[PDB]
Amino acid sequence: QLRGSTQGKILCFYGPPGVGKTSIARSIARALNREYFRFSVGGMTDVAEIKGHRRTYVGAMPGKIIQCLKKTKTENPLILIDEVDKIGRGYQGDPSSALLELLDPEQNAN
Amino acid sequence: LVPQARALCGLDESKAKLSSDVLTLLIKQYCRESGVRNLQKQVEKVLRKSAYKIV
Amino acid sequence: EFNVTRNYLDWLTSIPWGKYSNENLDLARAQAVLEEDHYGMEDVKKRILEFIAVSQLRGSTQGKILCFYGPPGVGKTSIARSIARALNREYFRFSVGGMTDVAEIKGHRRTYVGAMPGKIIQCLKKTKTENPLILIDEVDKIGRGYQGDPSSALLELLDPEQNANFLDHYLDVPVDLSKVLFICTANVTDTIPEPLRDRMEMINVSGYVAQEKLAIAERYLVPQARALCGLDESKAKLSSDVLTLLIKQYCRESGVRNLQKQVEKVLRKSAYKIVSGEAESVEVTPENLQDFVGKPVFTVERMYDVTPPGVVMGLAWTAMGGSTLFVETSLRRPQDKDAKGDKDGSLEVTGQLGEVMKESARIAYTFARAFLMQHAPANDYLVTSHIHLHVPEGATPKDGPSAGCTIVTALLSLAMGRPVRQNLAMTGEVSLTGKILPVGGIKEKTIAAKRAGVTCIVLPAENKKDFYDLAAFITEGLEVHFVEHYREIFDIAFP
Amino acid sequence: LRRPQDKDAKGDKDGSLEVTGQLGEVMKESARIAYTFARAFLMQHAPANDYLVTSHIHLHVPEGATPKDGPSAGCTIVTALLSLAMGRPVRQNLAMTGEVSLTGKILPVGGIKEKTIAAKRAGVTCIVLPAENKKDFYDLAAFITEGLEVHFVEHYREIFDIAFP
Amino acid sequence: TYVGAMPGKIIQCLKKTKTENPLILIDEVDKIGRGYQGDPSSALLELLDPEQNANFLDHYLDVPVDLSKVLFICTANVTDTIPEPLRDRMEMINVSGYVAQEKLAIAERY
Ligand SMILES: Nc1ncnc2c1ncn2[C@@H]1O[C@H](COP(=O)(O)OP(=O)(O)OP(=O)(O)O)[C@@H](O)[C@H]1O
Ligand SMILES: Nc1ncnc2c1ncn2[C@@H]1O[C@H](COP(=O)(O)OP(=O)(O)O)[C@@H](O)[C@H]1O
Ligand SMILES: [Mg+2]
């Protein structure tokens, strides 16, 4: 409210399960009026899912984040990435090292 | 919580009262955990059985 | 492209959009439609009565999801089909066990040459209703060893909030299936992934007992197979006694499959003995039974009446049914090689135990020898002799610790030489001072113990709440002794 | 045998086994229990003998049995040691099998058909089998059963009362 | 529509057999499946199911063609690798080995 334009942010919640952590996010989205969209990532291991593919492969589709942007048709929703702690981390290519390229506050702008 | 389940199941407050002592009794005896989820299951169970008892 | 578009339009058009199967709402009807079509299982019956009552009371029709789990062949799948017939919504089912990729649940991207929409969409294409009773089955052993769990897609399928707009690949459209009624089956809950396990109501089908297993045999198996094979009641009468013998000897399992198959062979060999055989009216008799099945596949019930020193009957809740595993231990070396020495007699544990059972056994040993010196200082049999120990494998891993109570009673028995009282089960864990602990899965245990002629069951006192949930006949004969502190067990075990 | 029998005439130290044959685990399990039961039977039977109580002993069980069937051979071992224990050549062409328990109660084992047909051509004449498996021996083609004598038992102490009259 | 778009193999069998009650013999079922489409087994099950196959309908011919009188059969080396939905639709029969004194009888006769 002191500086006009909307701002983004990253946050973490943690505690025992079932404290309402998921549901309250939706309540916040209804309060601030941003759009809501849940997205679990427990155990994900296809990093390409977050970043699409070369577009020359057959069957390629753009990664999730564009899919949700296409759904919300709005520049500034409120994604709810869930259960990041359980993200897949194996020899096949850990997505979590690619999440940093989203999550980093400065560089997400590009 | 209870009103939400009650609306979830169509019953209204006139039909299924839940005296508070029963509620404290449940949380203290019939399920223990920091989370409320299992208690949510219990309360819906009592409601839904109550609904069958009405119908 | 024209062919792919042909397939695509045909698929998109075939999907029902607002078609709603009608839903019967006669409580008096469904009551009989269930009770006359399946035996027992009061709780599931009562639950579906709950569901109907909720939907009729709560205005418009609604979907739901549930999770049965139990021993195989117990009727899990047939009740589901009967229920679908009862509720008037259309039926469908499909296996999930051992699959890894989601494409069968998720179709394909439809630019591929072999792409087709996922199987649920086929069920929609056939089941014209937009709210069918889907029946996923044996989720507990879904294939998940490959990199990338299908189970995440499964949780994507189940959770209602995104069930409203689930998104298949072959066609790119969100699709509500909240109206759809999922059901799922498992022989053991634990193997199912936690995020999905916490999302669903649980129900446990139990194992049928011989007395009731008979009545189902002579209501739904024999008539059914007889109509299947075309024989008529004029041809193939079976006295109940031969069925008893089939149960007593030729089949020994909590389910109703092996008895099913063997009855099938009998009826089949009867029909063969009609198509050309001299008899036009079979009447199996116990003497005659051999002709159709050959010599018995079981003869012993238990491996023998217990040897007094060093064995004990032990209930265990194995992955398939209950069972009566015996714990067995023995001396390992002459006891009195050096009466004056001081080097305590080592244990030898066996039975391919996981580590937690191993320490549990060691703990049990410590408490046992503690109690032995505690009340019998003069004795030394267990402090100065090596011993080897064996708990046969088979128990579900969670049940491993429960052996400990019996284990204590093992050593002390051998330490005393006193016979254990005949046909007297016990189970449960111990806590190093004789306090006894709650244990799960009591139902199947009491089932098998009844099956083995036990009469004087001994249980943790705390868990009595469940033992009084048993059917009135199941309790017959058995003499439960609820107890909590093991010193009581020493009283009852050795009068 | 593997070391001199009186290296410690008063020594309180075990007659350690040294098994060989590229064993699997379950065979180790069955072998160990067989070792113990042998030691028990001997103390119950010939208390004065202690050859097994104090004698380090090498043992060789050749590999080749199907692994699930591997415990079935235990009973043979149980006499092997006993023969060497008591110094008695085993009685001629008397093969035996079946799993055993700590009380010497033989248990059923599978694959009798393959077992019988293979032993038939070895010249064996007096097989002994679990009585609990006996019905399957009354399902094989009759010519297989002609020739060899058969026994049936439940407690191994009988088997010891057959092989060594 | 494809060049040489002959009806699938069963239709050729119907041609060769010139009769409505062949002893069709599916073979080596155990290792079918796991194609690019996952499997065609669903369509095979549609064949196996009498009410569906009663008006079985190939792509090459618009007419449904009943095949109720066909006597389908199956074989597989072992009853484990077969996909379950077909497995329940069929019965299983264990096949044994041969006696050495009888294997010679075969050796002489065939
Ligand atoms: N209560 C029952 N009423 C009628 N049939 C029964 C009942 N219980 C078992 N059955 C019989 O058991 C057989 C198989 O049962 P069902 O398939 O429902 O068992 P199941 O537990 O689904 O087995 P699995 O899940 O391992 O397939 C059926 O042929 C069925 O007739
Ligand atoms: N302070 C609270 N207010 C309202 N609901 C709560 C609260 N704490 C827990 N809950 C309940 O806990 C349940 C779990 O909520 P959710 O946040 O969806 O799961 P998670 O606990 O995994 O974040 C919801 O049904 C919610 O009503
Ligand atoms: Mg089933």
Curated annotation (Swiss-Prot), chain A:
Subcellular location: Mitochondrion matrix
Tissue: Duodenum, heart, lung and liver, but not thymus.
Residues annotated to bind ATP: 15-22
Superkingdom, taxonomy of origin: Eukaryota
Disulfide bonds: none
Subunit structure: Homohexamer. Organized in a ring with a central cavity. The ATP-binding and proteolytic domains (AP-domain) form a hexameric chamber, while the N-terminal domain is arranged as a trimer of dimers. DNA and RNA binding is stimulated by substrate and inhibited by ATP binding. Interacts with TWNK and mitochondrial DNA polymerase subunit POLG.
Family: Belongs to the peptidase S16 family.
Domain comment as written in the entry: The Lon N-terminal domains are crucial for the overall structure of the protein, maintaining it in a conformation allowing its proper functioning. The AP-domain (ATP-binding and proteolytic domains) has a closed-ring conformation in the presence of AMP-PNP and its N-terminal entry gate appears closed. Upon ADP binding, it switches to a lock-washer conformation and its N-terminal gate opens.
Protein purpose: ATP-dependent serine protease that mediates the selective degradation of misfolded, unassembled or oxidatively damaged polypeptides as well as certain short-lived regulatory proteins in the mitochondrial matrix. Endogenous substrates include mitochondrial steroidogenic acute regulatory (StAR) protein, DELE1, helicase Twinkle (TWNK) and the large ribosomal subunit protein MRPL32/bL32m. MRPL32/bL32m is protected from degradation by LONP1 when it is bound to a nucleic acid (RNA), but TWNK is not. May also have a chaperone function in the assembly of inner membrane protein complexes.
Disease / disorder: CODAS syndrome: A rare syndrome characterized by the combination of cerebral, ocular, dental, auricular, and skeletal features. These include developmental delay, craniofacial anomalies, cataracts, ptosis, median nasal groove, delayed tooth eruption, hearing loss, short stature, delayed epiphyseal ossification, metaphyseal hip dysplasia, and vertebral coronal clefts.
Name this polypeptide is given: Lon protease homolog, mitochondrial
Biological source species: Homo sapiens (Human)
